[PDB]
Design a binder for this molecule. Structure first.
Ligand code: HG
Lengths: 283, 50, 282, 284, 49
């Protein structure tokens, strides 16, 4: 395995200072919570209504009689997913002491990863305060096997949905759609015009480079110069196993590789949209 | 903030008779409506306690 | 790394005084909480009705009708929540007073603040000393300087946590939000204000961020036009990780922001002014 | 630094008796809770609808109808929640052959116009006959506020619930009372045989200084007349003291009292069945 | 629900890395947590993969 050295650069996000000026100590407990919940429902209603009416008529006298029958059927499917990270620190702050919490957000350069960074300290009251607004430090990162452009075989996984990019047939062309199959391999190429996604599982020979129809749908074409089958990456090279990447279309600059629930397939290229994809090297 | 948009299409029709001898008539109506509705809601809460 | 000396100024926000006059001690526990919840939903309803009516008349009339409604609600909800809880447990001795002062501390020049809590137990008696405002000194460790005209930066939307990128809209370069870490910028100031210059235009010479008459952000050739000039929120120097505001020099009420427009999503709109983070490239 | 001696009369409200007849002891925990929550919301809705319709028919049959509607709705809500609790918790060990009794009374401190909850717990051996307190009188020394001398000491008037001061503004070219944040609006109180009078010292029209009720309810400031409309009845016995919670009932309009209501331009009124609480504060 | 309680000694740093492990061929996966307490200083080692 290879290791690369980088700077981590952490930026202040929040702070807290507490002074215990008395001669008895104090027990401090800080709880920090973040969480998320996702709910989806589908409600299907059907009503059938039957009405029978009549009017008897002849000054002038009118008599009306009316009868209604309503039958209704509501079918509800709700589905919830939740998560929480709770994080609690409990300290005994001694008398005539000062407690400082600094929370920074740390960005690991090159790696495209970040982490929360908390600095706690208890010191005696006095001196002058040292606040870290921005801290740089060094780190060795254990990195994934390199995706050698043109050579190494990869799977493309939709990050949010955790399904893979698969080749199926739409309108007599090979076309991208999301699936569970671990059998669809790809190789990535770069040239003067940008990046190219070549499929190794096409059902129409020679039709292998991912491209955008004027409608948005991803199809696989024969190798041309057209920027429509070229793509812009989000990262600097090299690409490595596990990398979270983005593909913006080189011709349709406003738009990028995403999931939409289309008529037949579900991998599209649409304005203001770029879902994250995970590249993974096959064994 | 709750934003709602509703589009509604209706096609109706009546076939009827009258002055068609044997005095009295039959009428028949048929209608079809399609309604499409999108509501978008943003809610934000802020709470504290001592 | 550089380090600047500064005054931090804290002003009183809230206070509390507890006297235990008894001859047994007391266990006091103060516990404070602040939190947020953001909820977001989209509800799509599609509903289809078919009615068949009929009337026979002569007098006597007779009606019959039949309707069939079929409806489909699809809703999806997003919730995001957080909280900070701070607990303090103390034993106040007999014949003692406990005092708590809560201050809000503003660090000068740096544009950052923090909560400042002062607890103290003392004998009952003396004169209460209340800190309405305290100034103290601090040395702050700051970010590498964004030198104007020179140092290459990224512009990140603070709330959406994605970057400002250049794309083509209506055959001009235009700003949109993206995930790409490859879209660089350099900042300039002259007597007309600040200018945002992209190093990633697809049409040469068209590189200065400006507001269209509709509000959309495009990139122009360098002119003297106030529309391509911007007012920041802090004073120089700008440093890595600085939270900044871009208000337009021309349309004075409006500032650089996100909005979900027709083709792009970076705009310049009245009364709106989103926060951006400037990051110096490694 | 004034102190007055007085009786506090406490009166039974609730009771509880527990007997532990076993030969093992018991751990008892009484836990009492009182609380309130206030919710306030404002919901603004705006609906715009377009309808385009048409009918094709024949006469001298067949009819064909078509309509389309586009409807846009915008709902804006603001909700305010404010709440409080008080929880009192007692833990005791009752020994065997023992009886525990709790009496809850309500103590009224005479003259001062304050009250407190009074709790009496006792553990004794089973036997004897019970002593139940229905009402207990006891003495107490009250350390009381600086006195409001009528005619002389300058005071400010605070709305108890809203924590804002009575200020004087100009409505219809008259001095009118409104609520506000200013600690600048001083007053002095008078009593004669007609009742009590509120005099402002911050009027913008000289001589128009005594609080009175208009025929519609609003509070204005007039010249000192004999008019019962500029006289008021208080709730407390004299003397008035710093921090005193007071009522102002109108001497003329007897059913009505001094209160808050959100009016056209000012918000201090004199309305039927309403009597708001006011805190009187002696200035420096 | 997973909860971890640790005593962080003074002048020490705590590390939590969460990886998602993919077992090759088997088509199964698991959560992988790495906790470490070390003294402050040295050079940080982060496992991306
Ligand atoms: Hg906006």
């Amino acid at each position: 395995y290879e290791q690369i050295e980088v700077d981590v650069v952490a930026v202040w996000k929040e702070g807290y200072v507490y002074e215990n000026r008395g001669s008895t100590s104090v027990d401090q407990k800080i709880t920090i919570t973040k969480g998320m919940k996702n709910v989806n429902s589908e409600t299907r209603t059907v009503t059938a209504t039957h009405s029978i009416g009549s009017t008897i008529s002849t000054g002038s006298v009118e008599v009306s009689y009316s009868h209604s029958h309503q039958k209704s059927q509501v079918s509800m499917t709700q589905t919830e997913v939740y998560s929480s990270k709770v994080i609690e620190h409990t300290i005994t702050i001694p008398p005539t002491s000062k407690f400082t919490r600094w929370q920074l957000n740390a960005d690991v350069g090159g790696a495209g990863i970040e982490y929360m960074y908390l600095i706690d300290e208890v010191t005696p009251i006095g001196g002058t305060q040292s606040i870290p607004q921005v801290i740089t430090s060094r780190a060795k990162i254990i990195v994934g096997r390199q995706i050698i452009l043109g050579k190494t075989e990869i799977r493309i996984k939709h990050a949010e949905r955790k399904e893979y990019m698969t080749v199926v047939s739409r309108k007599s062309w090979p076309a991208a759609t999301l699936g569970h199959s671990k059998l669809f391999k790809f190789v990535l190429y770069e040239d003067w015009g940008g990046f190219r996604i070549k499929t190794l599982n096409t059902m129409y020979s020679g039709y292998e480079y991912a491209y955008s129809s004027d409608q948005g749908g991803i199809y696989f074409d024969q190798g041309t110069d057209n920027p429509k089958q070229r793509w812009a990456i989000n990262k600097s090279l090299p690409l490595r196993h596990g990398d979270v990447v983005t593909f913006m279309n080189k011709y349709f600059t406003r738009s990028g590789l995403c999931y939409d629930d289309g008529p037949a397939t579900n991998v599209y290229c649409l304005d203001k949209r770029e879902d994250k994809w995970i590249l993974e090297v096959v064994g | 903030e709750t934003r709602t948009v509703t589009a509604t299409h209706s096609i109706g029709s009546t076939i009827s008779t009258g002055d068609a001898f044997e005095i009295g008539s039959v009428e028949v109506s048929y209608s079809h409506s399609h309604q499409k509705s999108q509501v978008s809601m943003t809610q934000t809460e802020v709470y504290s306690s001592k």
